[PDB]
């Protein structure tokens, strides 16, 4: 249900907090947040390196906050 | 751009993560990573369509990750 972890990640990579005030489970990275190419690339890097989550926004057109939150909860980690 | 960014762009065109472990400034596109002609072309397309960056990766015989960053 919760997207707080992902909201904080976005904040962590430099997304402005005013862009994030209405974030919901169905909020989409491109179509709703309007994330830039550099921002999406930074997100893919940090998802992989911090959370073990591997996504490809070159290949896939978009992802919701929910799908990414769930990925984070599900992915195996050594910690 | 950093080596990290280049590594992600390469992942995103389907270069295997295993092939990218130990990637660094000196790593070469063709002689070390073994990029195919189709993969090279895919990298060009991604740079142009995702970032607005036009680069011709047949202008040189090969590119280290550092030359690629500078060229970008």
UniProtKB/TrEMBL annotation, chain A:
What InterPro entries does the database record attribute to this sequence? ACP-like_sf
**Highest rank taxon of the organism:** Bacteria
Protein name, entry field = Putative free-standing acyl carrier protein
Q: What species is given as this protein's source?
A: Streptomyces sp. CS40
- Taxonomic lineage of this organism? Bacteria, Bacillati, Actinomycetota, Actinomycetes, Kitasatosporales
Underlying gene: clmP
TrEMBL record, chain B:
Please identify the protein, giving its name as recorded: Putative free-standing acyl carrier protein
Q: Which domain of life is it from?
A: Bacteria
């Amino acid at each position: 249900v919760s997207v707080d972890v992902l909201k904080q990640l976005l904040l962590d990579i430099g997304i402005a907090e005013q862009t994030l005030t209405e974030i919901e489970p169905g909020t989409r990275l491109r179509a709703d947040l309007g994330l830039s190419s550099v921002e999406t690339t930074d997100l893919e890097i940090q998802l992989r390196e911090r959370f073990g989550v591997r996504i490809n926004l070159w290949d896939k057109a978009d992802y919701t906050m929910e799908q990414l939150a769930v990925g984070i909860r599900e992915m195996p980690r050594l910690e």
